[PDB]
Nucleic acid binder design. Structure first.
Lengths: 250, 383, 140, 137, 42
RNA sequence: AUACAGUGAAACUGCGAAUCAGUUAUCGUUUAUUUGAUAGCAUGGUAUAACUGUGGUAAUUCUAGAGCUAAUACAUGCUAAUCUCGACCCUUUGGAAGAGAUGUAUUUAUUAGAGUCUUCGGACUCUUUGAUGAUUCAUAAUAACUUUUCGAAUCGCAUGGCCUUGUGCUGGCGAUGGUUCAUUCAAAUUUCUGCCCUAUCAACUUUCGAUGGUAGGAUAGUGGCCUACCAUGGUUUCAACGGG
């Protein structure tokens, strides 16, 4: 019923009163999802305080990924889009260099799909197959070539799938968690243990490999074709010293 | 009139305007009138009336039909309010069966405590009709599969009595005695389907003895004849046609089940009437069962081929030619294996039978199998 | 824990019990009838309980005949008799066949009446029959 | 043996077909609760029952797999192993002799010897005090 | 009281039930088409 | 706005009222709430609140009496209808006579759930299912038991269309409810380590449970949490056991 031990990627100061917004129940976990209040108040500063955040939610105005959802503490977290008709905007909200949630600015034809790593797949009832992805989109009737740890392209206007994406060597991956948070690239080798501690290993320009547990990472896409425009010019975060060295060079 | 019926049910002065009492009990009115009138007849005494026997008869018919709960309870109270001698040892069973807590084992047990008196038979038949009037959706199913199975603990005479009780409202022997039936009532046509469902339920519950009652069997034949009459009397707005297709499929599958389940001490020497009805069912299209799931047509033909007695009424009509034609269709389905097994069973049971007609049917069957069993390419089961 | 139930035979009467987290449990007391099942070809029927003969942990229940799990039974044989002679056309295993004119059958209870409130029997057939006749011989 | 008790011992709901003939009368149910082991011949062609065993009984294994040396076997189907692991103390800055008691439910798959090393894993709690189960000695 | 609105809402409940079923058991068939495609593939 | 239509006190209903520390598993439990999927009678009766009155009582948020009247309160209750095979036609991307098939909740018993031939382009048949490390897993079929669960007797704004103008049949946006599954949030247990000083504490626990195994009961469940039956264990000089 309280807070202020908030996840520190929310850009939350300490002298903003005591409590933080407790994320209500929704699609995502609390530790990797930001609410609409911490979005619209102190992430892009379109509002000032919770009263007018309630005003711009119950103005029928916000539409998190296709629908209004008038709730201040609504945990719209990773890979969602937040469209607003006024201000022309669509925000796919993703991870970044340092770990916090980078906003995008996305046009409509890229804003009319999201994608999702499958969390589990089963057979639901009456013979019907059964797919649930990371946001609780329990979706019936996939294509039958279903793997787990696998990316499906959600149409997001009507809630079906429009495209399927497998996973193997030589196709992109993006990490959500660990020390290496918000980082792309997939080209070393595809090692697997049993009992976890396995990763699709990660490329670099200097062949730097980051290996974590496989629950965090999931596919964006392939070489030349990722399905999301990427933040800050394909952020791999080489070095601050290499950044200053490139500053001295060019 | 509802105020008048309420006032005459409140002021209980019976036998003062009892002139049209039995006529009103034999006449028709609404349900709001019927409930108050049955409450008044249960509030009366009915020992000495205009006709106390007619009052008890209308009480028995009301507890039969009853719409399965309310008039069943009211008529049970009326039957206890009458001369209910040798029924105080079954008043618990009557109240339990009229109540909605009718544990069927408890009702047949309290009657098994009230047994060796046989004074519970009409009440038990009316309770069976009340439990049979359950209609539609899985509560009616859970009650009907309980009722038709639990009524098997009864007398061997009273089972045929209940079958004749189902036969009574839709027998129509005076309608079908001359040529066939000519009047079409959908409400009585639905009762024929209810009799078909109850007879199939009783046959599946007890398919060894099955209890043949001849007027009930002829009434089932009359119901199938009314189905073919509606098919020839097509009502192409076709709610009646859909009801007649629902009645004829279950009717044929039920009439095949009775013969194919009893098959030893039933289907009496009047098999020519059923053969005539089957000829009427085959004269539309004899080869209308070319599917692999050919229900009751191929079953009746194969059961007549299997049981060696029925070959006489088989060869009365030319029906083995019809079964051979449906077998000798070009693109025939997986019922061709049952047709070949029928040829095996009908070779040593018609070619080893009486020479006048059964060997004639066997000769026609062998002449069919010589020049019509060519494409033996059953590449499926090697068995 | 909560109170004992010790349900008996005859006059079905069930407490309505709500427990921890929804999960409506039927604390049945004094069971009268029972659904039993042929264990080798699968036909089930509601069947009237007579008595309980065996208890596998305490002969206090052999005394008082309390219905619980895993208590061997002799029940009614009549609806199985009516199906056995009304659909067969035969109207008759051998040691199961020996329990026909004795008017009693043998089975076992698995569903808890103080938990589920049901009444289940499976007609024992085979080494179950052999061990439970040896248990009848252990008592007698 | 087949019995030690007033009740009967039987694999629940894994029954034979009591009409047709088979030369087992109870299909002895195979399982392996994980950990990459091959199924034991004593479970394929065994005779015991042991509802607390992880090869026929319905308990599952995962989680904390640890090892130790058997010292006590005197109980009923449960043995005590000796996790003889050395400890460290900030006072002495040396090493010291330490061990604790770990009981584990022994399975009659292979024999119960006093002195061997076992590899046992964390199970759903079989009793009041014992928490693990023998999956392999 | 029976209103023009109450049987309108009853009609809408009927329409919603029949529309949900008449989408569901057809989406079954469009899944079975892809299953038949993969069965012809393998 | 001659049912109602604005605000609306009161009241009912709905909703909400040694910290142990790090530390794994819940294939051992439930999962309110959010979120996403998800189910082929022109509409009946109670039994009452506020209120109107009669009082007691020094008095209490004390009350009894009768007259009243509401539901998303309590308690009953319903509409053929669709998917297969389709011989034939007339060419079909059909329409067809009809041989057929029919939800869910609980419980048990199962059962399934494992090298040629060529129009060189093509074919000529090859195997039934969702997985984890792992299953009596997920799921489907029969049989009945259900002190018979649900499958909407609900509400706000517009109220548009089809024309056979009935007073028909239809139709939008969304508020509540409700079956199951998943998610989310939780709880309650569980694996491994630790903290206060001590041998002027060396034996401690099977007293009236101590510690196991088998059944049963309790359990939301794994589980002496308990019952009986079978066994006589288990801990400890390692600083245990007891005490500061």
């Amino acid at each position: 019923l309280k807070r202020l031990a908030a996840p520190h990627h929310w850009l939350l100061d300490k002298l903003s009163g005591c409590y933080a917004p407790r994320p209500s129940a929704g699609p995502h976990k609390l530790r990797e999802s930001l609410p609409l209040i911490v979005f619209l108040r102190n992430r892009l500063k379109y509002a000032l305080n919770g009263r007018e955040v309630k005003a711009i939610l119950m103005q029928r105005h916000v539409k998190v990924d296709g629908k209004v959802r008038t709730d201040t503490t609504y945990p719209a977290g990773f890979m969602d889009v937040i469209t607003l008709d006024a201000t022309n905007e669509n925000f796919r909200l993703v991870y970044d260099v340092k770990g916090r949630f980078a906003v995008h600015r996305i046009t409509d034809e890229e804003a009319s799909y999201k994608l999702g790593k499958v969390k589990k797949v089963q057979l639901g009832k009456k013979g019907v197959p059964y797919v649930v992805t990371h946001d609780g989109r329990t979706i019936r009737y996939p294509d039958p070539n279903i793997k787990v740890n696998d990316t499906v392209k959600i149409d997001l206007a009507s809630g079906k799938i429009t495209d399927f994406i497998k996973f193997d060597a030589g196709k992109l991956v993006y990490v959500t968690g660990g020390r290496n948070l918000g980082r792309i690239g997939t080209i070393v080798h595809k090692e697997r243990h049993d009992g976890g501690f396995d990763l699709v290993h990660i490329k670099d320009s200097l062949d730097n490999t980051f290996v974590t547990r496989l629950n965090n990472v999931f596919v964006i896409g392939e070489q030349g074709k990722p399905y999301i425009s990427l933040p800050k010019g394909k952020g791999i975060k080489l070095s601050i010293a290499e950044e200053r060295d490139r500053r001295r060079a060019q | 009139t509802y105020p008048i019926l309420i006032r005459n049910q409140a002021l209980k002065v019976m036998l003062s305007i009892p002139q049209v009492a039995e006529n009103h009990f034999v006449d028709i009115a609404p349900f709001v009138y019927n409930d108050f009138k049955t409450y008044k007849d249960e509030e009366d005494m009915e020992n000495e009336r205009v006709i106390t026997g007619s009052w008890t008869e209308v009480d028995r018919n009301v507890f039969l039909k009853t719409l399965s709960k309310f008039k069943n309870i009211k008529n049970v109270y009326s039957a206890t309010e009458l001369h209910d001698h040798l029924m105080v040892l079954l008043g618990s069973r009557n109240t339990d069966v009229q109540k909605l807590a009718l544990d069927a084992l408890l009702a047949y047990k309290n009657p098994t405590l009230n047994k060796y008196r046989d004074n519970l038979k009409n009440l038990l038949d009316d309770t069976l009709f009340k439990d049979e009037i359950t209609t539609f959706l899985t509560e009616n199913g859970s009650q009907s599969i309980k009722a038709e199975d639990e009524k098997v603990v009864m007398p061997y005479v009273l089972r045929i009595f209940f079958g004749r009780a189902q036969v009574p409202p839709t027998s129509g022997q005076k309608r079908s005695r001359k040529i066939a039936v000519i009047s079409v009532l959908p409400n009585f046509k639905k009762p024929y389907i209810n009799d078909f469902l109850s007879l199939a339920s009783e046959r599946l519950d007890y398919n060894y003895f099955f209890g043949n009652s001849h007027q009930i069997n002829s009434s089932k034949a009359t119901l199938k004849t009314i189905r073919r009459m509606t098919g020839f009397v097509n009502i192409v707005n076709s709610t009646l046609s859909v009801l007649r297709t629902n009645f004829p499929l279950h009717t044929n599958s039920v009439l095949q089940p009775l013969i194919y389940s009893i098959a030893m001490a039933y289907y009496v020497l009047d098999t020519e009437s059923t053969e005539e009805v089957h000829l009427r069912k085959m004269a539309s299209n004899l080869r209308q069962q070319g599917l692999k799931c050919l229900s009751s047509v191929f079953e009746f033909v194969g059961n007549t081929f299997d049981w060696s007695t029925s070959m006489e009424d088989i060869y009365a009509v030319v029906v083995k030619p019809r079964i051979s034609h449906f077998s000798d269709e070009n693109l025939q389905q997986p019922s061709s294996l049952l047709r070949l097994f029928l040829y095996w069973a009908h070779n040593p049971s018609l070619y080893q039978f009486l020479y006048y007609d059964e060997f004639a049917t066997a000769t026609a069957l062998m002449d069919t199998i010589s020049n019509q069993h060519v494409k033996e390419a059953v590449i499926g089961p090697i068995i | 824990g909560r109170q004992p139930a010790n349900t008996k035979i005859g006059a079905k009467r069930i407490h309505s019990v709500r427990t921890r987290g929804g999960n409506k449990k039927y604390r049945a007391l004094r069971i009268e009838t029972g659904n039993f099942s042929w264990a080798s070809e699968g036909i089930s029927k509601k069947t009237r309980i007579a008595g309980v003969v065996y208890h596998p942990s305490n002969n206090e229940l052999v005394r008082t005949n309390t219905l619980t799990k895993a208590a061997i039974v002799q029940i009614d044989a009549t609806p199985f008799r009516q199906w056995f002679e009304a659909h067969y056309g035969q109207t008759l295993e051998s040691s199961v066949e020996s329990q026909f004119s004795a008017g009693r059958l043998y089975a076992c209870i698995s569903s808890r009446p103080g938990q589920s409130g049901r009444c289940d029997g499976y007609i024992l057939e085979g080494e179950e029959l052999a061990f439970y006749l040896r248990r009848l011989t252990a008592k007698k | 043996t087949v019995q030690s008790e007033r009740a009967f011992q039987k694999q629940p709901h894994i029954f034979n077909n009591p009409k047709v003939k088979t030369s087992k009368r109870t299909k002895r149910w195979y399982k392996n609760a994980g950990l990459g082991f091959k199924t034991p011949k004593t479970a394929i062609e065994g005779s015991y029952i042991d509802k607390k065993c992880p090869f026929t009984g319905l308990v599952s294994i995962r989680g904390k797999i640890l090892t130790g040396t058997v010292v006590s076997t005197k109980m009923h189907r449960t043995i005590v192993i000796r996790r003889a692991y050395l400890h460290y103390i900030p006072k002495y800055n040396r090493y010291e002799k330490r061990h604790k008691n770990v009981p584990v439910h022994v399975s009659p798959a292979f024999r119960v010897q006093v002195g061997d090393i076992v590899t046992v894993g964390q199970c759903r709690p079989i009793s009041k005090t014992v928490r693990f189960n023998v999956v392999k000695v | 009281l029976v209103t023009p609105q109450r049987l309108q809402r009853k009609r809408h409940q009927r329409a919603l039930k029949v529309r949900n079923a008449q989408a569901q058991r057809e989406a079954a068939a469009e899944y079975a088409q892809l299953l038949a495609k993969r069965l012809s593939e393998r």
